[PDB]
Amino acid sequence: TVTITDLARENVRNLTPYQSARRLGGNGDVWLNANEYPTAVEFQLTQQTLNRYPECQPKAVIENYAQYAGVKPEQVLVSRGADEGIELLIRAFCEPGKDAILYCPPTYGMYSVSAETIGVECRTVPTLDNWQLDLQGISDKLDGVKVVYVCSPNNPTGQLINPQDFRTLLELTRGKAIVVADEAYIEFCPQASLAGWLAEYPHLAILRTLSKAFALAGLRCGFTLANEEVINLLMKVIAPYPLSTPVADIAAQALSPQGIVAMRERVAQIIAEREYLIAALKEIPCVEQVFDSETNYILARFKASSAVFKSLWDQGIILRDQNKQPSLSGCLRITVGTREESQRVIDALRAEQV
Amino acid sequence: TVTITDLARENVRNLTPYQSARRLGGNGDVWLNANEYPTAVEFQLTQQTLNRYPECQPKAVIENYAQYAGVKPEQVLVSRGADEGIELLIRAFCEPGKDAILYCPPTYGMYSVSAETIGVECRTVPTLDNWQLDLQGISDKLDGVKVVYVCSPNNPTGQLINPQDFRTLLELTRGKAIVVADEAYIEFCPQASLAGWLAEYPHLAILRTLSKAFALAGLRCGFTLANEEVINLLMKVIAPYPLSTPVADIAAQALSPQGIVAMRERVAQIIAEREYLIAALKEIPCVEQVFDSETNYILARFKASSAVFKSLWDQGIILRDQNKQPSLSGCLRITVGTREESQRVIDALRAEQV
């Protein structure tokens, strides 16, 4: 007898689905584990046309985002979060069982998840001690690689990749692979974006999202910025109707001029709050080292991190354990929320210090 | 020099993206080409939690649908339309370059599109003259096939597949392949659903959608019904957050008891209207033959169909040309809308008759 499981693909049977879930409904009061904006921003529907299919790429959304990002509308693609953007790039440039992707741990886990699920080889070149790119290492492992993912600022470490090294990487991949800069957190450091580099690099793609700074993770709305050639190719592999009407509706509102002003105020808010938490964390006894951040989360190495993580978890303070990530032994990622939430963490951590 | 296009996958460069688009904004007044419910049904948001990520599988949505469909919640998966359900099945059971899918033309075009885009072989066994399954033909082409798609009632022909033949097909695939019954239009003939067959067939999956009868195509919300084993396997290949909050929100409302009552009234409405259009169409001179339908669209063979199609198109009456589909030479698919819209088609067609 053959079981349904035997009919499934081998890679599908062996893979471990992404570990994002870690809920405790009604148990945790403070959520600082998903890099979400701490407060809800309300939006109501304005288009009551739900009986009709939406546009494959809602015009209002594409133009409003292109205006905001400073690029041409033909250089923008909108999808179900930056997660889908990650999938699309692999789906269009990587031949299963032949080509490979390359990323540098410790970083965002979906690059690997998508590739492994799709059936594409994952090539890894860990970043250096300061988490900057190991350029020499990358140059020696580009064979068969079609897509390179580099998160900047990086998750979960928080720092920006030296643009000078991005220049090098883009030169190493010229005519060989697509370089994808994941800018899911660029809103917190807009001046460090590579969006203006499109004219110089035909193989440069950029991932963006409304989940983080825009405080609309609930919409599952993201974008890919790239030259026409690339965008047109991705459009050939995307689902016919990737964005729902209600999402296109509120997303377009969120991208209006006033929406951008609000977003920027949310950023200033988070940055100011981050610098507070960072200053306070360095003084706490159980805190060994706090790493610089250009995002809405802070990575810190603790003394007995598993114990600390568990302690705060039992107290309703939900953080994000990084202990199992390469080079991040003893580290926990703390999302920046409100002043009250930061104070909860601070006090709680001071209650440790053993 | 290497171009970006040269970096793309071969199959991606050669494939022709799905042909669903065929708009004429502000030009066409009557849309009977996408099998959408003719009138909008309004829904407002109730959950202002957009700053937080949604559940991977919204509980309210899964339970409300499971209640409606008469199956267990663990036998339900919710995705971005039935289109994604099609993708997921291939993504989980078909090894690119090794396994294949099988469908029977003329039918829904996405089965082939997804497989071709993913990189999986498409095996075809055209249906018989009456569009019923060519069982003997299928039995002889199952080697290497992992997923079989059969739309019932079928699009664009409109008829139901003899359940007796579904029995045969399910026996032929036992322990060899997953049989997927696409029931995107089962709401119009609920008693013909195979949902109650799950306990007998471990390899049976069923595609459902809120786009059609539910009049919520704008939500991009669909479902897959299958035994736990299958659903759990698909959950291993689905994107972490496939459904947005606003969509889960209104979808759950649409599936409430009162929502189901409304849906059923929409169905009765469409069926009554369909039988009118069918009766009237058979009398029109340019109409050669009208085929029986158990859905919200009617297939009919005309005299000089390309000419008729163009004529009505220029008049704001948007139909769906099937002329290039196998065995459907001279056929146009007419979506059932309102009495006024049906009258527009009738009169317009009578204005032809040359």
Ligand SMILES: *[C@H](N[C@H](COP(=O)(O)O)Cc1c[nH]cn1)c1c(COP(=O)(O)O)cnc(C)c1O
């Ligand atoms: C956003 N990821 C979310 C939180 O970060 P982490 O706990 O996984 O390090 C959670 C998530 C979303 N999908 C899977 N996990 C994120 C994205 C995707 O953003 P979208 O909501 O638009 O799909 C892309 N890149 C990065 C670096 C991050 O953090």
Ligand SMILES: *[C@H](N[C@H](COP(=O)(O)O)Cc1c[nH]cn1)c1c(COP(=O)(O)O)cnc(C)c1O
């Ligand atoms: C619904 N398909 C829509 C109209 O039918 P057609 O003109 O393609 O024959 C259009 C569409 C949607 N995606 C691509 N084209 C449909 C589905 C999908 O329904 P969802 O809106 O939930 O993804 C699945 N199966 C069938 C048979 C049909 O018709």
